[PDB]
Copies of this chain bind each other. A is one copy, B any other.
Amino acid sequence: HPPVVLVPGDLGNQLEAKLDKPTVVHYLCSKKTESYFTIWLNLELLLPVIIDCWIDNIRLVYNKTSRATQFPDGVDVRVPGFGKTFSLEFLDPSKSSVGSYFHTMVESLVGWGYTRGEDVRGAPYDWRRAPNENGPYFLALREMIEEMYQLYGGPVVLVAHSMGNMYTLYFLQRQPQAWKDKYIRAFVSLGAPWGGVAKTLRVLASGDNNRIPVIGPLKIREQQRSAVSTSWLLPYNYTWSPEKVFVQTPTINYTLRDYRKFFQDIGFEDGWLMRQDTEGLVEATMPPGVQLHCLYGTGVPTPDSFYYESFPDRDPKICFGDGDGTVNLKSALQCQAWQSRQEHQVLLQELPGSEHIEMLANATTLAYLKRVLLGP
């Protein structure tokens, strides 16, 4: 069986932090820690009495001089488990039911003959950032793939979920074709947000605590705005219409042509700079150049626009379209466009009724993956 590398989406692998901060926002917050602690996912840190401490540690500071993000002073954040699977099978070190992520898929692979950290390996990353600030991650990923090719006697299958598809596409578009032809067997794409997702507007405007409801919406908005990866997934012109209204107020309508004014009207102009930094990272029409399987969910009510009666501090009324609940269905059209652009096969597989996160543990998803890896 071919070696496998797993690339998670946003919030899709653990993060750890160590503190030696010059100041704290509240006298209850720790200034300095003995060693690293799990900052995601750790329910203990999200209680209302100390939720402000967690925000001050997991947010990113944007630097206009360098056009890059920085951790807050004295805070280090590292990504554990690179080349392994534990930080990616469960999001909470206690391994709760809520935080079960890649575990079901990893367990299937091991059942088929794989060995964790050997011929199946995870490629976690700091999903708060866009690819332009994870240069070292992609170098590490290339070396891991070359290593796995040598050890297990064949090219590697890349399995990416959610935002990880955009990380993997960025990686593949920038490797030479001869390298991909030698080292990559296939690219299995699970719920890829090609061209952005409409819910990104709501995330920036008023926050979205859907995946971690213990955090108040205005508190998580502080962290979600500071993450470059949020603005990176704003809707793109090569998928959406420039006339499409994503945010509607009694006064103004915001299309994808109005991101500059949108960021100014929500009091977060740094978002516009991060959109500038990230809008051109993924080439609009360049295919990955490897055999591709695009698996996408349909039949799940998916937010396509938002109406605010009180903008932007009150939850909006959501208007729903088709998709997997997160990724709008029109994103799958991008996969179909790559057929004419590359020789390698591009297979599209609709998953009716399969939700964005739940497709990772779905038996139909795993059945498709099994045919790719083990053959007929």
- The complex places the Cα of A375 from the Cα of B177 at a distance, in Å, of 10
| Contact residues of A between 335 and 370, Cβ < 8 Å to B | 340-344, 370
Cβ A341 vs Cβ B375 within 8 A: yes
Task: List chain B residues, Cβ under 8 A from A287.
Answer: 375-376
- The complex places the Cα of A249 from the Cα of B60 at a distance, in Å, of 79
Q: Within the complex, which residue of B181, B343, B376 is in contact with A344, where a contact is CB–CB below 8 Å?
A: B376
Task: List chain B residues, Cβ under 8 A from A342.
Answer: 374-376
Q: How far is the CB of A297 from chain B (nearest CB, A)?
A: 22
Q: Within the complex, which residue of B180, B343, B374 is in contact with A370, where a contact is CB–CB below 8 Å?
A: B343
- The complex places the Cα of A290 from the Cα of B375 at a distance, in Å, of 10
- The complex places the Cα of A342 from the Cα of B287 at a distance, in Å, of 25
Residue among A177, A287, A290, A340 with most chain B CB within 10 A: A340
Q: How far is the CB of A88 from chain B (nearest CB, A)?
A: 26
Cβ A374 vs Cβ B343 within 8 A: yes
- The complex places the Cα of A177 from the Cα of B371 at a distance, in Å, of 11
A1 at interface by CB-CB < 8 Å: yes
CB-nearest residue of chain B to A375: B342
Q: Mark A280-294, 1 if CB is under 8 A from B, else 0.
A: 000000010110000
- The complex places the Cα of A121 from the Cα of B241 at a distance, in Å, of 37
Task: List chain B residues, Cβ under 8 A from A376.
Answer: 177, 180-181, 287, 289-290, 342-344
Cβ A375 vs Cβ B343 within 8 A: yes
Residue among A287, A342, A343, A375 with most chain B CB within 10 A: A375
Given contact pairs A289-B376, A342-B375, a sample of 18 additional A-B residue pairs in the complex whose CB atoms are under 8 Å apart: A1-B340, A177-B376, A180-B376, A181-B376, A287-B375, A287-B376, A289-B375, A290-B376, A340-B375, A341-B375, A342-B374, A342-B376, A343-B370, A343-B371, A343-B374, A343-B375, A343-B376, A344-B376
A-B contact pairs, 20 of them (CB 8 A): A1-B340, A177-B376, A180-B376, A181-B376, A287-B375, A287-B376, A289-B375, A289-B376, A290-B376, A340-B375, A341-B375, A342-B374, A342-B375, A342-B376, A343-B370, A343-B371, A343-B374, A343-B375, A343-B376, A344-B376
Residues of A within 8 A of B (CB): 1, 177, 180-181, 287, 289-290, 340-344, 370-371, 374-376
Query: Considering the complex of A and B, which 6 residue pairs feature the smallest CB-CB distances, nearest first?
Result: A289-B376, A342-B375, A343-B374, A342-B376, A341-B375, A177-B376
